[PDB]
Amino acid sequence: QSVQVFGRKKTATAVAHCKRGNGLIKVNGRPLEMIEPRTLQYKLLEPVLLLGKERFAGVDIRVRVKGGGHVAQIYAIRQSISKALVAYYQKYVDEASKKEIKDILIQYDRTLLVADPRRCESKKF
Amino acid sequence: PIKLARVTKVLGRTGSQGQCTQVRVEFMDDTSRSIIRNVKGPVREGDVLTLLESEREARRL
Amino acid sequence: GDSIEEILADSRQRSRAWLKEDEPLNFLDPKVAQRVLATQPGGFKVSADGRLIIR
């Protein structure tokens, strides 16, 4: 049993797969702490630090990203990690846990669950 | 002496290019004095203003 | 073909899909095919009596 979600930015699309495990997070086969722009390391670690290391201990997430850029991928990774957990706690944990996760995760930053509807504007003759 | 004032309502924007707005203020030490002032920049209700001299009421057409 | 909108009508390209984003989307849900779509989402004169005027 597992849950398959997505999160997006301008063009950087992510897909996340979460199932039972011991608490490892991988992106494109690499750990969460080896993703290349180390200045924005906290944006990758925000859903882990807001919720706690204990809350992620029952789930293993593997994330794949394609497209966009260096910071557009980080904003899509952090979205689909948090969105994978709120979907996993809904279907296989009681809704009281899912409501309190979705509560504190929106009051921090609204882009962890609801995507940013901003895309490049076209040009016409 | 420096004086602080809280605005009450925004009367409208004045100036030739509309670079100012005219706002009615009320004080903090005593809520009786209500003078009229001109300010530049974005102003809304409830803003607190620092008035250098609280003697003259501003005026423009 | 028989709904009210379809009958009252004033009369590469097929691979386009619209994801929808609520509860977060799960691709391994058995009811996920509901939340994907295949197409686009989303005069006469009146008398003083109120009767229509047709010509």
């Binding site: - | 009367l11 924007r13 005219q22 | 994801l19 989402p41």
Partner: peptide
Amino acid sequence: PLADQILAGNAVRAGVREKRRGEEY
């Protein structure tokens, strides 16, 4: 009225001007 005319000439008109500038699926 005189007082209406003076107060209109002392305050600033404001109000009406509409400037026209500027996801689920």
